[PDB]
């Protein structure tokens, strides 16, 4: 019976493991019986997330309902070469691992432009391929970073709201970002941050591709969840 998604992931909540927080990546064994011990799943660190802007808190309990869950070995896309000029993989001092005081979630890649910033972009489309094993469900984790007006213009060539949509399995999501006047930081790494991230997931059923349409600040998916089977959650 599983309680935590990743045993041997100490100091990690189920939502930390679901997002691939640094120090929170490890074996997630199979289980036919599971207890749902968190009604409102919570993170214990990283860059601060505006969790309730999306359904992201259900992700551990969705994984909980599968018999087998595992984090993919390869990146679902090449984030640095994704559309929108060349990107640098952003890291934050809020997300350390054993060999770096900076880092970021292993499920996502912070696409930071490289003096192609100045160009604010019209909406860009990337296709998210199915990479799991033949009969498995793929859960794709993505999101977007936003910041205050001055930092949005510094990181990106735009201080205006960016808009993000996702599509898979006939299910569409849509978002517009927020500049400044953010909620207080909660469930994060504990360092002050002028911006936040919004994190979402989309399910890709066996053999089904995904689509993300984005602008500046996108968090492109890297490591996806490959899940199969069915587990009795209690």
């Amino acid at each position, epitope marked *: 019976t599983r309680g935590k998604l990743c045993p041997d992931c100490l100091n990690c909540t189920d939502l930390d493991v679901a997002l691939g927080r640094p120090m929170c990546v490890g074996t997630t064994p199979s289980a036919k019986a599971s207890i749902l011990h968190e009604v409102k799943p919570v993170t214990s660190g990283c860059f601060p997330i505006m969790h309730d802007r999306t359904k992201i808190r259900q992700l551990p309990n969705l994984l909980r309902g599968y018999e087998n869950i595992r984090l993919s070995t390869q990146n679902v896309i090449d984030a640095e070469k994704a559309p929108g000029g060349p990107y640098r993989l952003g890291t934050s001092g809020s997300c350390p691992n054993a060999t770096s*005081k*900076s880092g970021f979630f292993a499920t996502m890649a912070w696409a930071v432009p490289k003096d192609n910033n100045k160009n604010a972009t019209n909406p860009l489309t990337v296709e998210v391929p199915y990479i799991c094993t033949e009969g498995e469900d793929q859960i794709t984790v993505w999101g977007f970073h936003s910041d205050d007006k001055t930092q949005m213009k510094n990181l990106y060539g735009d201080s205006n709201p960016q808009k993000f949509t996702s599509s898979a399995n006939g299910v569409t999501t849509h978002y517009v970002s927020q500049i400044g006047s953010f909620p207080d930081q909660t469930e994060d790494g504990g360092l002050p941050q002028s911006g936040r991230i919004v994190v979402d997931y989309m399910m890709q059923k066996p053999g089904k591709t995904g689509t993300i349409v984005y602008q500046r600040g996108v968090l492109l998916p890297q490591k996806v969840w490959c899940a199969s089977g069915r587990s009795k959650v209690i």
Partner: antibody
Amino acid sequence: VQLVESGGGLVQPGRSLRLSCAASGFTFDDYPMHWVRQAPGKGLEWVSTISWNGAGLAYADSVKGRFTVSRDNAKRVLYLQMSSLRPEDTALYYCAKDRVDTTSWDYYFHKSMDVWGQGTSVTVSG
Amino acid sequence: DIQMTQSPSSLSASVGDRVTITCQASQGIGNYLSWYQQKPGKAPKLLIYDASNLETGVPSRFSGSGSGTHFTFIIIRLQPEDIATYYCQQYDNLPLTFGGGTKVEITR
């Protein structure tokens, strides 16, 4: 890998000065860069640090509010705009490369400095 | 702010002698300390980084050790070209701070 500081000279107190550091021989925009100064006969003193993009700045308290670090990644130049210059700003100003190509700009974009320039000398005097 | 207390301020030892330089942090900097060598009339050079890693090209007679608040820089067999002032520097937290330096000279 080469760093070449320039722009040092004799300034009257209260005036402004800009030092430039011409980087070459490495991918300059992957790395944080540093300014370190040294009064004659005295030890190394850190001035400023800038992240790989322009979004992360850091200053010693001696210079906060008076100095501005900046960079041109296309030109591959690190800048240090010094204003309201004081006689104790007199020093040899070193350009320095970070050993690690950190992508972060919020915290800890600073590690050991593996390449230094030969410095440009600034004398603040009337 | 973290002071780096470096000692001795100056020393002089014969060729082939052992040189021991210590750097103290007023607070825990963990691993993030480096050692620089500044020869007379020259700019600093990285010898040691992350308290024990020996930078490219620098000889095996140089070695560093320590963590937390205490760090040790050692020249195992002093050589005439080691005439310099050596500096420790912490990069664990802002503001970045250096040690006062340690002048090494040959007793010949």
